Structure 1
Amino acid sequence: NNHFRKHWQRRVRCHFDQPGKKVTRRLARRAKAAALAPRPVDKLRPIVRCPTVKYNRRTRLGRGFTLEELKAAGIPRLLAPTIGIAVDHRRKNLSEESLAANVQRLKDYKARLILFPRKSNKPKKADTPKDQQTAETTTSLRTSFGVEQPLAPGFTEISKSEIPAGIEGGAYRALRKARSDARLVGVREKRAKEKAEAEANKK
């Protein structure tokens, strides 16, 4: 199964520039950090759960925080991208748990945020005072605000008295019954409708 029947030699890409490109990327990152100092080099990202049944076990970083997350955290949507927070207006919060986790994440960031005044001689009440402006900082939000628990714990200890009884009939039989009911949902509905029509006709 070799696909060499076209003029493949015109489109061969070698990668001798791999260490040079790593050096170029590191120089660009150092320049970006020096331009952004004392801000972190990256923006804060929310925690989202991967789609599909293969990957819904694991969480990861998403694009940006939702508008309802920002509203529940008390950060206006025009202020948020100016203080290192990514905003995503497309994502919605369908469930309470992800919303609560990302709201707590935003609150921890806001509690650890040091906001310098726009004019040094005229600080405002929303600004961090000068005698709190000096503290140890982080320059990597992907590290200091990473995904701490991407997966659930695979091991947990409980007492023998707290062992669950289990579903009646067994887990295998419960799976078989659930599959059977899903396959027979429409047949039973049609049969019930026909029985109701017959009962109405010959009541």
Structure 2
Amino acid sequence: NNHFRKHWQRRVRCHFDQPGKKVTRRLARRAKAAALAPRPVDKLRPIVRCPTVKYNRRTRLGRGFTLEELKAAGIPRLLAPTIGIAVDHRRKNLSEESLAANVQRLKDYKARLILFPRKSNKPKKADTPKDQQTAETTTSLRTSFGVEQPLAPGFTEISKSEIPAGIEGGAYRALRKARSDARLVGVREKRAKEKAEAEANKK
């Protein structure tokens, strides 16, 4: 199975510029870091869980924090993109756990945040005082605020006194039964309505 029946030599792409493009990307990143100093080179990203049943075991960085997450962390939505926080209005919080995890992430970032005043001679109450403005800082939010546990721990120890009893009848039997009711959910309802109609007719 070789697909060479078109004019394939007209659009052959070679990659001799791979090291040069790496050099160009590194120079661009250095320029961006120098322009953005002392801010980090990237924005804070939330922790989200991958879709589909294949990848829902693993978490990763998402686009931005939700408005509910920002409101529960006390960060206004207009201030958030100005202090290194990415905002995503499309994502919603369907469960408490991801919402709470991202809110704690935002609180940790806000606790570690140093905010310089807009005017040096007129500091405000929301700004970091000059005696606390000096510390060891980080320039990579993807490294300092990475996904520490993408997967659940694969090994845990318990005593044999607390071994669970298990599903009555067996796990295999439970799976077969659940599939059986999932396939027969409509038939039972139809026969129940038929029996109810017959009972109403001949009560």
User: Which category describes the TM-score, using the shorter chain as reference length?
Assistant: over 0.9
Gaps of 5+ in 1: none
- Distance in 2, matches of 1:194 and 1:15, equals 70
TM score, norm. by length of structure 2: 1.00
Q: CA deviation at 1:164?
A: 0.2
TM score, norm. by length of structure 1: 1.00
Q: CA deviation at 1:196?
A: 0.1
Q: CA deviation at 1:16?
A: 0.1
- Distance in 2, matches of 1:129 and 1:202, equals 85
Q: Structure 1 segments of 4 or more deviating over 2 A?
A: none
Q: CA deviation at 1:22?
A: 0.0
Q: CA deviation at 1:139?
A: 0.1
- Distance in 1, matches of 2:17 and 2:169, equals 63
Q: CA deviation at 1:136?
A: 0.2
- Distance in 1, matches of 2:199 and 2:65, equals 56
Q: CA deviation at 1:73?
A: 0.1
- Distance in 1, matches of 2:66 and 2:109, equals 15
Q: CA deviation at 1:70?
A: 0.1
- Distance in 2, matches of 1:175 and 1:156, equals 25
- Distance in 1, matches of 2:97 and 2:128, equals 31
- Distance in 2, matches of 1:47 and 1:65, equals 9
1:34-92 Cα shifts (integer Å, max 9, x gaps): 00000000000000000000000000000000000000000000000000000000000
Q: CA deviation at 1:138?
A: 0.2
Q: CA deviation at 1:110?
A: 0.1
SS at match of 2:158: coil
- Distance in 1, matches of 2:136 and 2:10, equals 54
Number of equivalences: 203
Residue aligning to 1:52: 52
SS at match of 1:157: strand
Q: CA deviation at 1:130?
A: 0.1
Residue aligning to 1:130: 130
1:157-187 Cα shifts (integer Å, max 9, x gaps): 0000000000100000000000000000000
- Distance in 2, matches of 1:152 and 1:96, equals 18
Gaps of 5+ in 2: none
